[PDB]
Amino acid sequence: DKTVRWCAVSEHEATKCQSFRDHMKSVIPSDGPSVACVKKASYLDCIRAIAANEADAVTLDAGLVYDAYLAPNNLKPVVAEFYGSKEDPQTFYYAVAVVKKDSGFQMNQLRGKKSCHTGLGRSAGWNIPIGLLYCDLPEPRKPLEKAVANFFSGSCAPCADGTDFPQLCQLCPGCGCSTLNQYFGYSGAFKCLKDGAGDVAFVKHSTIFENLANKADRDQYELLCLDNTRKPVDEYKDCHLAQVPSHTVVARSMGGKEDLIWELLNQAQEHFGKDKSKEFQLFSSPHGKDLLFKDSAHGFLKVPPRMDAKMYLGYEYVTAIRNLREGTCPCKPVKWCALSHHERLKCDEWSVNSVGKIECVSAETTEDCIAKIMNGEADAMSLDGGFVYIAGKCGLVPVLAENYNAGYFAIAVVKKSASDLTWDNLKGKKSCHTAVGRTAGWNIPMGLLYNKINHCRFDEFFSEGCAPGSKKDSSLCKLCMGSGLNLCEPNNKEGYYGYTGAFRCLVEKGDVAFVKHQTVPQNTGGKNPDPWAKNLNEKDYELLCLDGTRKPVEEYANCHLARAPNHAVVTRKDKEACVHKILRQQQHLFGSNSETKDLLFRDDTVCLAKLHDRNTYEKYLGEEYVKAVGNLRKCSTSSLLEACTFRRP
Ligand SMILES: O=C(O)CN(CC(=O)O)CC(=O)O
Ligand SMILES: O=C(O)CN(CC(=O)O)CC(=O)O
Ligand SMILES: [Fe+3]
Ligand code: NA
Ligand SMILES: [Ru+3]
Ligand SMILES: [Ru+3]
Ligand SMILES: [Ru+3]
Numbered sequence: 112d113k114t115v116r117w118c119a120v121s122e123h124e125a126t127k128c129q130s131f132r133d134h135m136k137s138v139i140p141s142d143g144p145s146v147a148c149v150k151k152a153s154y155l156d157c158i159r160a161i162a163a164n165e166a167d168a169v170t171l172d173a174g175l176v177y178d179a180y181l182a183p184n185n186l187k188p189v190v191a192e193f194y195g196s197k198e199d200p201q202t203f204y205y206a207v208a209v210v211k212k213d214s215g216f217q218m219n220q221l222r223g224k225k226s227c228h229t230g231l232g233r234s235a236g237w238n239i240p241i242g243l244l245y246c247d248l249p250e251p252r253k254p255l256e257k258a259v260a261n262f263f264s265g266s267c268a269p270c271a272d273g274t275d276f277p278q279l280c281q282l283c284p285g286c287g288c289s290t291l292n293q294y295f296g297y298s299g300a301f302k303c304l305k306d307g308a309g310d311v312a313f314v315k316h317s318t319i320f321e322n323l324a325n326k327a328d329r330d331q332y333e334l335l336c337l338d339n340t341r342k343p344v345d346e347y348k349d350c351h352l353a354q355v356p357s358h359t360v361v362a363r364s365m366g367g368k369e370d371l372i373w374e375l376l377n378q379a380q381e382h383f384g385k386d387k388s389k390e391f392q393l394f395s396s397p398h399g400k401d402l403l404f405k406d407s408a409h410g411f412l413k414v415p416p417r418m419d420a421k422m423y424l425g426y427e428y429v430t431a432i433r434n435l436r437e438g439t440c441p442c443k444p445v446k447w448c449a450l451s452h453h454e455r456l457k458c459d460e461w462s463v464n465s466v467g468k469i470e471c472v473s474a475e476t477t478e479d480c481i482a483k484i485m486n487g488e489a490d491a492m493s494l495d496g497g498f499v500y501i502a503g504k505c506g507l508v509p510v511l512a513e514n515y516n517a518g519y520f521a522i523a524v525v526k527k528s529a530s531d532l533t534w535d536n537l538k539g540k541k542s543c544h545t546a547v548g549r550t551a552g553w554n555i556p557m558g559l560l561y562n563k564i565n566h567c568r569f570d571e572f573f574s575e576g577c578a579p580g581s582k583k584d585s586s587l588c589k590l591c592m593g594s595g596l597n598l599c600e601p602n603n604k605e606g607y608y609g610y611t612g613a614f615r616c617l618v619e620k621g622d623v624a625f626v627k628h629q630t631v632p633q634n635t636g637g638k639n640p641d642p643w644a645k646n647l648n649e650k651d652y653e654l655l656c657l658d659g660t661r662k663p664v665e666e667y668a669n670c671h672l673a674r675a676p677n678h679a680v681v682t683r684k685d686k687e688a689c690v691h692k693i694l695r696q697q698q699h700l701f702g703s704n705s706e707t708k709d710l711l712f713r714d715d716t717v718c719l720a721k722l723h724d725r726n727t728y729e730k731y732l733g734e735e736y737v738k739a740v741g742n743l744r745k746c747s748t749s750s751l752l753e754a755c756t757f758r759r760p
């Protein structure tokens with residue numbers, strides 16, 4: 112049977128679950144999902160029941176989503192409650208630190224300041240800010256209130272033990288835990304900042320806009336970002352302490368039943384959701400408050416399947432809570448992420464030769480690696496510009512570029528015999544790409560071509576081709592050479608994958624190859640001993656220039672599609688400085704003074720350059736590059752990008 116066993120934590124919740132059960136039976140057909148109702152004493156008892164295969168689903172706040180993730184529960188987010196309009200679904204809130212403009216201090220200078228909290232034990236007002244500050248607090252850190260009382264000079268921390276720690280209630284004597292206290296709650300803590308009582312208020316992004324209508328007033332405030340800078344209040348998305356999901360349905364990581372859970376809930380909102388006015392209303396609690404779901408919910412969004420709990424909660428939230436739960440405080444080694452059995456081996460060699468300054472983490476895919484850098488399991492890796500885009504939108508930034516001598520050149524290579532082909536009209540021809548979503552083989556050439564055909568349905572523009580990463584049924588997988596499941600994969604087991612592979616695809620099957628300016632020189636004239644390249648001459652090939660003409664291969668400077676941004680090392684913002692130093696020190700020892708091919712870094716890289724000003728993916732890639740990728744995103748199929756675009760569009 113297709114049964115979703117929902118877990119309730121109270122008799123009122125269980126009664127609603129039963130009404131939920133009986134009404135869905137009148138709406139869902141025989142082959143569809145039905146609900147069962149398991150009543151337990153608490154949210155943690157529900158988490159344990161789900162993990163024990165005695166129930167299937169429960170909706171949790173962020174704190175318990177974290178608890179549900181830890182072993183041995185290992186639950187996962189599947190469906191997201193959303194609020195507000197259908198056009199702009201508000202799935203998360205942002206915990207921010209608001210300050211007065213020109214007060215002259217950053218997040219890392221809060222010791223001694225006066226703080227305004229919404230209330231002790233609340234998320235944005237306490238657990239998150241104190242969670243992040245935890246190791247900055249003085250020892251002993253237990254009890255936590257004593258440590259905070261000895262960190263801020265004074266504060267208003269409603270519901271704090273002012274008798275034993277009167278510093279915490281200096282700004283609100285008694286620290287009344289009710290609205291009788293002027294500085295209690297979300298309006299109160301911001302009022303505690305506005306009135307001049309405190310120097311910082313830990314609140315939600317929307318508190319400022321709800322308590323100050325005129326933007327002129329809002330300009331007198333700023334936000335403290337975790338990189339120790341400030342930003343205006345309406346840039347909370349790029350300057351917050353944490354992005355927190357409001358209410359989240361969780362299920363087992365393996366054993367589900369994510370498929371049924373979404374079918375059940377999506378059906379339920381379509382017939383009993385907001386503005387549906389039936390006997391049974393999914394988001395009403397006739398004899399309670401927020402039973403099973405929050406009464407203010409407007410519907411449900413499916414959580415993208417690539418996303419786990421650490422990625423859904425976010426790096427900084429996980430850091431804050433882990434500090435509160437465990438209470439553990441210490442440049443540290445840089446954990447590099449390797450993708451192959453050949454790449455890991457190089458990493459282990461590199462690790463022992465670094466006297467411990469480099470450690471090694473592994474994963475199957477680049478996206479898996481990028482996810483491990485986001486959550487802290489890994490620290491750094493080198494990426495093609497196309498993956499830097501993914502990494503940037505996922506939160507990471509570039510810290511070092513690999514220089515090869517401004518970046519490398521992207522060109523279109525054809526066979527010289529074929530005198531007919533031009534850049535003007537390539538429709539109906541056979542294309543060879545390094546892979547989908549890569550700088551030289553896709554983002555640059557297909558970005559330009561998008562502007563000339565007005566769509567990204569490129570399998571209907573070219574007759575066929577090989578663009579590793581495309582869907583296996585696509586005409587852009589027909590020319591690939593991989594065998595079995597390897598066919599058309601964007602990895603080594605597909606022989607037409609990469610710069611060289613795409614050129615090989617041209618030699619043997621295709622009409623045009625989109626690669627970089629050195630690819631042809633390195634695979635002709637005997638440079639590449641493989642049979643497919645051994646006897647090739649670089650004079651039998653030429654490049655397609657944008658004006659519509661063709662030029663020889665070694666004249667790439669005058670005949671090129673666009674300058675491609677170099678590959679770059681990406682990391683988290685909180686480890687940018689440390690990766691920048693250890694690697695600049697590492698190439699000084701092992702630089703210009705790989706067993707297989709392009710392990711960790713490309714093999715034609717001389718050094719690792721600094722960027723200074725270009726420490727974000729938009730600054731590094733360029734404006735025109737980012738807009739091209741935006742146009743190509745309409746037809747793109749990246750699941751990692753889908754997940755971290757669910758948090759940050
Ligand atoms: O919240 C509660 O537990 C009390 N109930 C009364 C009851 O048990 O029916 C709320 C109400 O129904 O108004
Ligand atoms: O390559 C250069 O140095 C200048 N480019 C612009 C560019 O590469 O985007 C001229 C051109 O490509 O037509
Ligand atoms: Fe590249
Ligand atoms: Na919390
Ligand atoms: Ru009751
Ligand atoms: Ru119907
Ligand atoms: Ru009743």
Ligand SMILES: [Ru+3]
Binds near residue numbers: 671673674
């Ligand atoms: Ru150019």
